């Protein structure tokens, strides 16, 4: 079976941007020229997967809904649910084991950005894999942030270790995952870490283990990006404004990768633009048509 | 009298800024590090007003609320109050007219940035004057766009026209206005333009007919920065970045400015800066007292 | 036969840029954290090229003499030639005949940034290809500037044209090209255009009445880039410095794509880094082995 | 007597910007859109200094001079001389010995960047400064790096130190020193420090030792860049565009400076501009006057 749900963890406490993050969500400030969760909603749909719901605070959850609504102006199926708190990532399992069902499921953070030639041709793979699961390694700045893959001469990966004090190597694990069904019966084992938190890195150690981890390599032609700090955040608008105004296109724009994958027609993508073309959102989409 | 009352429009539209602002109000976005209405706030405070309205939509004042509180955290006395549709700037002393009383008032908009050597200086002259009005003409590449005052060959100024289609002069006024206790008549009897808005500059051209308005000039060595713009909101990102990196010091730190101020001691710095040492913001603070 | 050689313009007059460019050279001009040459040699180099001819003005090809010296220190094989006068792209054919000899060649503008995942694979089929040229097709926001490229109904490109008034697509032509040897032929009978320069587009036009030319798609998901302005330069170093600080990476580095291919072994890298190791560039390699 | 001599020390060999600064002096590379020199000789002719002495290495010194040239254009008389290699900012009252004479000089690091309201009225204080010397304290976010200013609780500066392990405040002394002619027998007698290098901080500290050093507060409001890292460096450019996008002025631009303070006259600035209004410079030129 393909993978045909998803779900964007889109809360956390975002401390790390305090005080941007204190009266506006994480997912919710703006890269450049949209809201940050289109970024990630974006992949998920490059992907093929339509059903997803959608995670974050008490009080958040209701702004995500109240912009996005049931997404079904994007061919989508929207759905939304509310974590009491930000206990860990591996929690969206547990939160969203009904909608999950008996089937497989991706998970991207909101507050990741995917962007590469070939990105959809990447995730296609880990969509169709009968069963285990597939995470993308990465080389970053600094990996001891990060859940880290150690990998053996061979280049085989070998152990995962969530923000190792001495990271055995530069690969950091990304905020796309994409799993099997039997997903949520390990997280809802899970017991929280010293830090107090279900982790995702003891989620995909299990899969290495049983020897049903694909560790993809996202290679370095790739952008991943997260805004994790005031900095980055910045850089992140700056890489994405670059992009638009050589190209003339739009870097993750829902409206436009909806269309052309014919999970709407021209004429909805017109009703949806009309409110959007006092700029030039609005005008892009009109002229794609 | 001292200009001891000020209001901060932080309501609007923002269509420029769709589907950015779809979600998120144009003064709850970050520059760099931090909300922008944390810009003109400070700005007020720099010039010695503590008791502030803002003003902002239906929708988006409790935000605000939510964010400030009533400001004693910083030795301010802040208030609320709904703006029922973005009708024009002029409508801030209808809307604040029994905070404002028999007072004097300064108005400054949510989303100008102002930063510069001895800005303070500037500010108090008119914080000083007696009566009448005081604006500040900056240049500026796409004067159009604003209100537009025009000066004689001495170097008087004139007359002020808003968005030209020729403007007489690149001088526009920025968004920050003094103005005496007859601002609120002169607003109640202001009738809508074409444009159908109440008009910030007919007023200012009744100061500037009766003899009464002050154009002081506001020179280059100063930095005068809008946000309407997917571009303009990233430059000032950028500028801010620039400079704070630098110099390890924050742009329009309310904190910092209230303390330095004397707005509060060190007791309730150390206090505010306890529970957010976590952050950089924290750490700032404490490394300040 | 594979393409085993290749051309740098690295000259030309630089006007939009002056004063920047009355002292310095474009192609010296740095892009965050190296010149500005260094990413069209890399590009070359990915292409699996090691003996290519470096082209710029009489004052500024001993320049570069100077900066990349014959380039046995990354195992390539570099020589140089001056062009007296900016009379053209094509010109590059005249110049460079002696050193193309009898061989196929490829042509990169000395300005030009290429960046993107599967870029090495995408040149492989042009350095391939047996006879005739290959050139990429890239979506951006001002065609004009460009050798535009129009394609019929069914996708096959049937026209370029050199800056026309009314572009018919918004598909430009790269500054990366690939030739067979009839290049040479052909520009030595080209006559120059009205604005007085040896078209390049005019041999495009020759391979494609022929029925010769591969016009390769390059990606949105590809990044390619040019510097002629204030703006487009400052945009790109942005774009590299936001993807290297992010990654840990750098982009372009010839020393460490010549260690990669296998162009030169780990003894040389760590040779070239010693004296280096003082600064991030020194230390950047010596991680790197 | 007002200070009319000025060096602007334009060498050092840049190991830091490696290899940016392998082909091209740090001090020609551009910021935004003119060479880097183009800000510290501004800053000289803003506070009245037309003499100058222009000194760089071996290599580069016949360089400025082609670019420059005697400056008469600007209205200015430069000179130019070689310092054999880098050994240390004092040398520069060595090697300009003979220019100085009998006369006060100012001395402003060829890489440094100061801009902000009333900077010319800042300078004035110190170029009319009848004998001593004066030089300026910025707060920076790393002391370390520079000479380092320690004050006592009323606010006087006490001590100076290179580089100290542990600063004693955050104020560096920035790259403009003005001094009177005693400065040339101080850096006579000056030895080498532990580094090898004859330091001006000691040149400062002698002053202060014989209570003639005015150690003038260069405020937050003021901005002071340096270009030490490819990271600063792109910052300052990004710095720059915004305000002179914003503005629709430039920073640091010789030919105005000249014209507004009456170096030269409109019929002079035409004619330099004639060959760069292929860009906005020249245009820019053109329309100031
Ligand atoms: C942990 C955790 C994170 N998040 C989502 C929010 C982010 O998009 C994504 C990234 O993890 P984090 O970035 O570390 O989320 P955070 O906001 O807690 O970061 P910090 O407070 O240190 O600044 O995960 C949750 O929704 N729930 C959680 O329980
Ligand atoms: C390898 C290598 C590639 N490149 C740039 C060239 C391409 O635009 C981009 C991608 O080339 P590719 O390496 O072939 O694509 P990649 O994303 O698979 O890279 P990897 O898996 O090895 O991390 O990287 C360099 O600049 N330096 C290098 O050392
Ligand atoms: C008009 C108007 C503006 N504003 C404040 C919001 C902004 O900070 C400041 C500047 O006004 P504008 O920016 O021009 O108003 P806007 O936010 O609707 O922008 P757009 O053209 O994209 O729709 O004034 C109000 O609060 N109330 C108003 O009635
Ligand atoms: C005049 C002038 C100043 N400057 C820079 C130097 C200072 O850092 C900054 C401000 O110096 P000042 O010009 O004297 O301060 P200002 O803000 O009053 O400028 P004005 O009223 O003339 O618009 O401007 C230039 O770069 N070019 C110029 O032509
Ligand atoms: C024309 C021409 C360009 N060039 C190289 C230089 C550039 O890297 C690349 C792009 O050409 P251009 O950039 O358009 O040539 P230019 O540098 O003169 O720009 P301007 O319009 O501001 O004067 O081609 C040459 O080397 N020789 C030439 O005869
Ligand atoms: C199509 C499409 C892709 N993408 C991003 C997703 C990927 O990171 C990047 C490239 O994916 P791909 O589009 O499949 O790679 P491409 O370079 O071949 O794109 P094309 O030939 O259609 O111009 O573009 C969008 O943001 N919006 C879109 O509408
Ligand atoms: C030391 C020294 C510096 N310089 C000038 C060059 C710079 O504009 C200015 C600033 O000092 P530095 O910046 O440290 O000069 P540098 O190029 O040696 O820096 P690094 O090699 O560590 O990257 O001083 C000289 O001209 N001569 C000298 O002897
Ligand atoms: C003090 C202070 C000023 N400001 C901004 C406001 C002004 O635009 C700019 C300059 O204000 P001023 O402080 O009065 O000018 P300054 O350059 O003399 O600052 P100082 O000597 O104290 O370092 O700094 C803050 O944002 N926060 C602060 O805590």
Redesign the interface.
Same mark, same amino acid.
């Given at each position: 079976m393909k993978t045909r749900k998803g779900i964007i963890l889109a809360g956390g406490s975002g401390?790390?941007?305090?005080?941007?993050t204190? $009266?506006?969500s994480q997912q919710?400030?703006?890269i450049?020229?949209?809201?940050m969760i289109?970024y990630p909603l974006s992949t998920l749909m490059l992907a093929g997967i339509r059903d997803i719901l959608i995670i974050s605070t008490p009080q958040d959850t209701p702004?995500?809904q109240?912009?996005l609504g049931d997404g079904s102006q994007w061919g989508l199926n929207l759905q939304y649910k509310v974590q009491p708190s930000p206990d860990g990532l591996a929690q969206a399992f547990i939160i969203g084991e009904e909608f999950i069902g008996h089937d497989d499921c991706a998970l991207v953070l909101g507050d990741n950005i995917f962007?590469?030639? &070939?990105?959809p041709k990447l995730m296609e793979a880990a969509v169709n894999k009968e069963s285990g699961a597939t995470v993308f390694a990465?080389?970053?700045? &600094?990996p001891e942030r990060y859940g880290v893959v150690e990998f053996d001469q061979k280049g085989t990966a070998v152990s995962l270790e969530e923000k190792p004090l001495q990271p055995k190597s530069?690969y950091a694990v990304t905020g796309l995952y994409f799993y099997d069904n039997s997903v949520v019966e390990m997280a809802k084992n899970l017991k929280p870490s010293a830090r107090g938190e279900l982790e995702i890195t003891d989620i995909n150690r299990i899969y290495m283990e049983q020897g049903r981890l694909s560790v993809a390599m996202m290679?370095? =032609?790739?952008?991943?990006?997260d805004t994790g700090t005031?900095? %980055?955040?910045?850089? $992140? %608008?700056?890489?994405i404004?670059?992009?638009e105004?050589?190209? =003339?296109?739009k870097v993750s724009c829902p409206e436009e990768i909806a269309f052309r994958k014919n999970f709407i027609n021209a004429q909805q993508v017109i009703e949806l633009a009309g409110?959007?073309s006092?700029?030039?959102? =609005?005008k892009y989409l009109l002229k794609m048509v």
């Open positions: 401390t790390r941007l305090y005080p941007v204190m $009266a506006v919710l400030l703006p450049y020229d949209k809201p289109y702004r995500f109240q912009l962007y590469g030639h &070939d990105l990465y080389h970053v700045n &600094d530069n290679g370095r =032609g790739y952008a991943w990006l005031h900095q %980055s955040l910045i850089e $992140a %608008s700056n890489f404004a670059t992009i105004e050589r190209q =003339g296109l409110p959007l006092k700029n030039d959102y =609005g």
